[PDB]
Structure 1
Amino acid sequence: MRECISIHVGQAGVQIGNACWELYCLEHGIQPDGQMPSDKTIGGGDDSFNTFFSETGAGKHVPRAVFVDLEPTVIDEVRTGTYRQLFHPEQLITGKEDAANNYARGHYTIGKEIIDLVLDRIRKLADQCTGLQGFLVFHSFGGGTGSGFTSLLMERLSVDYGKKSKLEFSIYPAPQVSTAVVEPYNSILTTHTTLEHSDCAFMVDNEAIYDICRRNLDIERPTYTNLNRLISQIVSSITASLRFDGALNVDLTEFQTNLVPYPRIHFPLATYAPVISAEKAYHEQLSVAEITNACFEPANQMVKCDPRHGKYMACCLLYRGDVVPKDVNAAIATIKTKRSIQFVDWCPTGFKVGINYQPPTVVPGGDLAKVQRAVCMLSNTTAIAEAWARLDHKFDLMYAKRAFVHWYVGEGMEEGEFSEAREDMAALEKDYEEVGVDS
């Protein structure tokens, strides 16, 4: 009835997709080979998981996902792993050479070789839908494929579909921790090119999740798997309203309607609570008010920034499980009372509420404790202007010397595109400065 297509671009996208699809199969009881042990009805019915899983053959559920990568390493990890029989063999699309953390490669040189194949696969998936709401694109800014090919695919999908919601789950470049030396270039170019072709891009940060795993989960040494599982919990909290009925449902279009005040400001920060280990779970009364208050703690934000340095323009609180709406009402009123949580004057109604019935599902061998309820906050705040200014300063420092510029110019990039992207980023910084002014 209502379908959603997930697109996983780059290594980060594919790994987060592995985590998300493990969590989906756990929540819906789908075996790793697509079979269902309680498969009483075959060939129809509801079975609300038709949003992400399509019924094929006789008693097999195939994810509505396209995995895209330019090198075969990660997709081959997928092709020979636990869920090799889950995905359609043609949904796992690979090139032959990586983008080498080069936006120019993944956008012009290499992305042009498989963009048509990816779009044809996406078209084949979309033709099997009757109520396709939108797409979910998982990627990272500071990467190669996940930046250049992500922007190219966003442009092509904006051309082909147009009015379908285009949501992104992006790994924002951390302010201190980093992987690539040329992350500012790729991040600025991606932001410039995919800005007007995206509806809502959810921001997460590896450094903030590191800090959350250290402080809250009591994990001194987490790997990328723990980060991927937490991001998967966030994704499941976002899509649970589609996959499960609740007291107050929120489809995907309501996110872009409620969280995006202006067409150029669509970067809401992800936040999840409660995130606690199993040891301290027995010593806390995880009430609605406690989790609602923990959602606004500066130490619990999934992006390394300080919300107290800015104002909230739009906030979305998605509750799950044993949640009473009166308690949500009271907790949000208490939040509005606090003077340390500043909202813009031009948004007197600042919250959007969603309440589901399905409690969070514990992944076997996971980190998070079994809780009765959880809240995922998607807040659009002006505090991300500081992160954008930091990225702009790094970009300026690297570009004033023309460092690494030849690596992009020799791949089909015209040098003026750097200047154009930088001017647009300055304009975006001015946008964020202007919306934060009370008048």
Structure 2
Amino acid sequence: QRECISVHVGQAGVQIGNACWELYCLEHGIQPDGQMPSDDSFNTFFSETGAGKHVPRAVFVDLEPTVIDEVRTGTYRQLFHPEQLITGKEDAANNYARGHYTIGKELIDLVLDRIRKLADQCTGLQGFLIFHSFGGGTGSGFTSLLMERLSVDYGKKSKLEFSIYPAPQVSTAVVEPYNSILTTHTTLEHSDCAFMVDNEAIYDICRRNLDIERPTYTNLNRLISQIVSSITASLRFDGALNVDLTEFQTNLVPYPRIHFPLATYAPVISAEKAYHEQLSVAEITNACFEPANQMVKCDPRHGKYMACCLLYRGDVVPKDVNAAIAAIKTKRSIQFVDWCPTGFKVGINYQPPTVVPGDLAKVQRAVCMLSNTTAIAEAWARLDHKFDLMYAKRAFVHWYVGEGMEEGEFSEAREDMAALEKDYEEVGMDSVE
């Protein structure tokens, strides 16, 4: 009854969604055949069909195969309808021009057609959850074109991203600042809330608390999957504070442009550290507020917390939730913005977090903080500085302009980012009038 469509664009989107649906099938007790062994909680992320097959409400888009083919030849081949997995024929090749101008048109009509066909088999659609990076050509250009077309066709809907930001230190590609600047410039006016996840901060988390020494990207994608499975948990189960996507939308976005929260999680403990720990409410709230479980590499003390929502999941009591929030509002290390005295959105659910065969521990409590803070101004600024240093003397510009890109959109993307940093500064300082 309260459904939202998942879109998975790029290799990051496809692998994160692989981990996501791996979590979702064991959450709602669905075997990887579509059949559910022997109540409306499955209707939101799965769709009922005769003989009990439960098809996902997901569109896996990738401009190049073998990443979709991992799904089509893996253990989840029968769960997905084998047309929803949409493949191109050429890799977009880390290029926003290829992603949005030249090879996006051979699939945008098919992707929109299947978005429409999945949307029509839906009574109350709550919106879109879109998984991509600010990186590769597919995950930048195709999601930019998708935001364009979804703004034209379903403009009143909610569009929430779960983006993989380029890390300020480690990165993946040379062309990362170009692609990131272009996708966020084109997507600033059409994206409505973008939850920001950074791989180096996941690295620090899984290295420090989760006791893994050499994990691949699969653990990172699973940790993102838990965050999305608990932002979307109250419209699936029953609690006391029932929170929805439009609730998060209103609560996290003060200004029309200012819509970039960071997602953080409670215990990422790996079960040789859990039986020796209370795992209560106050200490996991403190752990989320700690400036080390931040999931993008920025210091909150180098910034201002401005609006946050706590999503408590499991056996939680509202008095302890209130006590934790009252304890947080007193400490001066975590300081709010002076014009927002009510800066907390509380949403609690009665479903304990599941365990997938994986590495996260069996816990009875979890918290996701989704926090729109000014401290990601710096994280925008380092990538802008990289953009300047690489844009000084036409590095890799000919690759863009030879595909259909106009040189002036590099410029207007740069001043759009300048206006975004100016808006962050303008909302930063305290009121004096």
The alignment's TM-score, normalised by the length of structure 2, stands at: 0.99
CA deviation after TM superposition for structure 1 residue 235, in Å: 0.6
CA deviation after TM superposition for structure 1 residue 305, in Å: 0.7
Q: Deviations over 1:176-225 (max 9, x none)?
A: 01111100000000010000001101000000000001110111111101
Secondary structure, aligned partner of 1:58: helix
Could you tell me whether the CA contact under 8 Å between 2:134 and 2:164 is conserved in 1?
yes
Could you tell me whether the CA contact under 8 Å between 1:216 and 1:275 is conserved in 2?
yes
Secondary structure, aligned partner of 1:155: helix
RMSD of aligned alpha carbons = 0.7
Q: Distance in 1 between matches of 2:107 and 2:238?
A: 38
CA deviation after TM superposition for structure 1 residue 67, in Å: 0.3
Q: Distance in 1 between matches of 2:365 and 2:356?
A: 15
Secondary structure, aligned partner of 1:279: coil
CA deviation after TM superposition for structure 1 residue 144, in Å: 1.2
Q: Deviations over 1:131-180 (max 9, x none)?
A: 00100100000211000000100110011001110000000110001111
Match of 1:90 among 71, 83, 88: 83
Q: Distance in 2 between matches of 1:421 and 1:222?
A: 36
Could you tell me whether the CA contact under 8 Å between 1:261 and 1:313 is conserved in 2?
no
Q: Deviations over 1:104-132 (max 9, x none)?
A: 10100101110010000000000101100
Secondary structure, aligned partner of 2:289: coil
Aligned residues: 431
Secondary structure, aligned partner of 1:281: coil
Could you tell me whether the CA contact under 8 Å between 2:166 and 2:172 is conserved in 1?
no
Secondary structure, aligned partner of 2:163: strand
CA deviation after TM superposition for structure 1 residue 4, in Å: 0.8
Could you tell me whether the CA contact under 8 Å between 1:102 and 1:186 is conserved in 2?
yes
Could you tell me whether the CA contact under 8 Å between 2:8 and 2:60 is conserved in 1?
yes
Instruction: Note the 1:318-337 alignment, pairs <5 A.
Output: 318-337=311-330
Residue 376 of structure 2 corresponds to 384
Identity of aligned residues (%): 99
Runs of 4+ in 1 over 2 A off after TM superposition: none
Q: Distance in 2 between matches of 1:334 and 1:358?
A: 25
CA deviation after TM superposition for structure 1 residue 436, in Å: 0.6
CA deviation after TM superposition for structure 1 residue 278, in Å: 1.3
Q: Distance in 2 between matches of 1:2 and 1:290?
A: 32
CA deviation after TM superposition for structure 1 residue 90, in Å: 1.0
CA deviation after TM superposition for structure 1 residue 361, in Å: 0.7
CA deviation after TM superposition for structure 1 residue 47, in Å: 2.4
Match of 2:300 among 294, 302, 307: 307
CA deviation after TM superposition for structure 1 residue 57, in Å: 2.2
CA deviation after TM superposition for structure 1 residue 93, in Å: 0.3
Secondary structure, aligned partner of 2:60: strand
| Structure 2 residue runs without a partner (length 5+) | none
CA deviation after TM superposition for structure 1 residue 69, in Å: 0.2
Q: Distance in 2 between matches of 1:58 and 1:132?
A: 24
Secondary structure, aligned partner of 2:156: coil
Q: Deviations over 1:269-301 (max 9, x none)?
A: 010011111111110001100000001111111
Q: Deviations over 1:294-351 (max 9, x none)?
A: 0111111111110111111110100011100010001001000011111111111010
Secondary structure, aligned partner of 1:412: coil
CA deviation after TM superposition for structure 1 residue 89, in Å: 1.1
Could you tell me whether the CA contact under 8 Å between 1:310 and 1:342 is conserved in 2?
no
Q: Distance in 2 between matches of 1:398 and 1:420?
A: 16
Residue 415 of structure 1 corresponds to 407
Could you tell me whether the CA contact under 8 Å between 2:28 and 2:41 is conserved in 1?
no
Q: Distance in 2 between matches of 1:141 and 1:243?
A: 30
Secondary structure, aligned partner of 1:349: coil
Secondary structure, aligned partner of 1:278: coil
Q: Distance in 2 between matches of 1:266 and 1:416?
A: 26
CA deviation after TM superposition for structure 1 residue 58, in Å: 2.1
Q: Distance in 2 between matches of 1:198 and 1:274?
A: 30
Could you tell me whether the CA contact under 8 Å between 1:335 and 1:341 is conserved in 2?
yes
Q: Deviations over 1:17-43 (max 9, x none)?
A: 0000010000111000111111xxxxx
Could you tell me whether the CA contact under 8 Å between 2:31 and 2:37 is conserved in 1?
yes
Residue 43 of structure 1 corresponds to none
